[PDB]
Amino acid sequence: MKVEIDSFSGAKIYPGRGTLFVRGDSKIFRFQNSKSASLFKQRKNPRRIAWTVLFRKHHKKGI
């Protein structure tokens, strides 16, 4: 078992779930589901999306 992390949302990626993306600079991205993959493709900033893990620590919520 290797549970991955969402590159956009900090979500647990269990085997089979979501999609892996390889960028032109050969940088791997992993998305738990197509909600996070689409927001990444639209170039949304994960630090400004209120439910992503990157946002939650940036605003110190549930400390």
């Binding site: 085997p15 089979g16 979501g18 999609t19 390889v22 960028r23 032109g24 050969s26 791997i28």
Partner: protein, 136 residues
């Protein structure tokens, strides 16, 4: 696909039918590869022969050095951009469509590869694996 391959390839989703134009990933001179045929492709009425990652294809060069243009040469697809599933359950894809010019025996005409290379292509073609850098 075809002859020269170092083993078998588990099925990859086809995303590159004939008439597709994919990038050239090597320093051979070509800047694009126009797929005209897929090696080891079946016959079905009105179905386009379609390539996948690691497939030997027959291609022409549309944009590139004039000495490579107006000829049919073999090529190996190294990036797909069509989502496909590996047997460990992961669906992955690249940004673009990339290939490298090869000969029928499978060895690479250029000496380097620009960008990531699919693992299935590297495993099946040892000469692509030698000239590849990062792999997925």
């Amino acid at each position: 696909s075809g002859n020269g391959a170092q083993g078998t390839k588990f099925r990859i989703s086809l995303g590159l039918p004939v008439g597709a134009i994919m990038n050239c990933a090597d320093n051979s001179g070509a800047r694009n590869l126009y797929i005209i045929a897929v090696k080891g492709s079946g016959s079905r009425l009105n179905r386009l022969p379609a390539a996948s990652l690691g497939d030997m294809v027959m291609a022409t060069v549309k944009k590139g050095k004039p000495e490579l243009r107006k000829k049919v040469m073999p090529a190996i697809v190294v990036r797909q951009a069509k989502s496909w599933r590996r047997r460990d359950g992961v669906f992955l894809y690249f940004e673009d469509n990339a290939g490298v010019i090869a000969n029928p025996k499978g060895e690479m005409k250029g000496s380097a590869i620009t960008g990531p290379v699919g693992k299935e292509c590297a495993d099946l073609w040892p000469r692509v694996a030698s000239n590849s850098g990062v792999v997925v």
